[PDB]
From Swiss-Prot:
Organism in which the protein naturally occurs: Gallus gallus (Chicken)
Compartment(s) of residence: Cytoplasm, Cytoskeleton; Cell projection, Microvillus; Cell projection, Lamellipodium; Cell projection, Ruffle
Function: Epithelial cell-specific Ca(2+)-regulated actin-modifying protein that modulates the reorganization of microvillar actin filaments. Plays a role in the actin nucleation, actin filament bundle assembly, actin filament capping and severing. Binds phosphatidylinositol 4,5-bisphosphate (PIP2) and lysophosphatidic acid (LPA); binds LPA with higher affinity than PIP2. Binding to LPA increases its phosphorylation by SRC and inhibits all actin-modifying activities. Binding to PIP2 inhibits actin-capping and -severing activities but enhances actin-bundling activity.
Name the UniProt record assigns to this protein: Villin-1
Tissue: Specifically expressed in epithelial cells. Component of brush border microvilli.
Region (Headpiece): 1-67
């Protein structure tokens, strides 16, 4: 698919789901973080995160306000 746009961490954490930017899926907020923000928040590669069990992906996001 088309490369996703990048959005600041605070926009993703503070904006209600229905108020988010066009193209932004609130169930996949981590995919819109810049590489710098993703690395800082999750401390692992995107592929590594995507390969984790769903419960773990969700739990890590919950502790960061990204779920």
């Amino acid at each position: 698919p088309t490369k996703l746009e990048t959005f600041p961490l605070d926009v993703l954490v503070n904006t209600a789901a229905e108020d988010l930017p066009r193209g932004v899926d609130p169930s996949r907020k981590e995919n819109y973080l810049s590489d710098e923000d993703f690395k800082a928040v999750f401390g692992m590669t995107r592929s590594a995160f995507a390969n984790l069990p769903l419960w773990k992906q969700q739990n890590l996001k919950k502790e960061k306000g990204l779920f």
